[PDB]
Amino acid sequence: MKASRLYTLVLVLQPQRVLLGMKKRAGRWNGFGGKVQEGETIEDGARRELQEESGLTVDALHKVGQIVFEFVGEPELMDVHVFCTDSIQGTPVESDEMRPCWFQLDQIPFKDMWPDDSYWFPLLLQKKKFHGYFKFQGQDTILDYTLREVDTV
Ligand SMILES: Nc1nc2c([nH]c(=O)n2[C@H]2C[C@H](O)[C@@H](COP(=O)(O)OP(=O)(O)OP(=O)(O)O)O2)c(=O)[nH]1
Ligand code: NA
Ligand code: NA
Ligand code: NA
């Protein structure tokens, strides 16, 4: 089994809207996140990436899922720990890396999101917790995947 590298993903989910960021360099909407760094907890890494990529600070996050990504031709898995929050207290800021944008929850931009999001995003919206795995060929093609609702992440 391949080694895996730790990542975070943060979704700011309010009652009628969700905050996504457009990757400027890419072209897809996503939550905010990145690699966990040495010596920080996964949750603290998620808080740090949220602040670095969107400008938003939150004191706490709720872990809602975990997704492992495998890419054909790449030696490592990406182990993505997915967090939510409903409570923010500043404005999102656009950088040269991510442009934040709010979407109403009847306008989730799936056509411009990664293909796996179509499977697990609906569980997140239902307040369900999940474990997923997706094997991609390139950016567009899923060759294999698993997804399961769990009571504990
Ligand atoms: N919704 C969704 N999110 C994904 C998928 N694959 C995937 O890596 N992510 C998330 C997890 C990561 O936090 C982020 C990709 O990490 P990144 O490449 O932006 O990491 P980074 O910013 O630290 O790297 P760098 O370019 O700044 O050096 O996107 C996916 O298929 N769907
Ligand atoms: Na980042
Ligand atoms: Na990132
Ligand atoms: Na899509």
- Gap between the Cα atoms of 100 and 22, Å rounded: 6
- Gap between the Cα atoms of 93 and 109, Å rounded: 20
Number of domains in the chain: 1
SS3 label, residue 73? coil
Method: X-ray
> How buried is residue 111: exposed, middle or buried, by Cβ count under 10 Å (0-12/13-18/19+)?
exposed
> How buried is residue 121: exposed, middle or buried, by Cβ count under 10 Å (0-12/13-18/19+)?
buried
Q: Which 8-state DSSP code applies to residue 32?
A: B
Q: Is 66 in the pocket of ligand 1 (CB under 6 A)?
A: no
Nearest to 87 by CA among 19, 31, 13: 13
Nearest to 132 by CA among 146, 118, 119, 143: 146
Query: Residue 46, Cα to own-chain centre: how many angstroms?
Result: 10
Query: Residue 82, Cα to own-chain centre: how many angstroms?
Result: 5
What is the token pair recorded at 110? 């799936």
- Gap between the Cα atoms of 31 and 21, Å rounded: 6
User: Ligand 1 test: best mutation among 35, 82, 133, most atoms within 8 Å of CB?
Assistant: 35
Which residue's CA is minimally distant from atom 16 of ligand 1?
A: 34
Q: Can you list the alpha helix ranges (DSSP code H) found in the chain?
A: 42-54, 117-125
- E strands within the chain? 4-13, 17-23, 29-30, 62-71, 77-85, 98-104, 129-137, 141-150
Check: CB of residue 93 under 8 Å from CB of residue 100: yes
| 34 CA from centroid of ligand 3 (Å) | 4
Owning domain of residue 58: 1-153
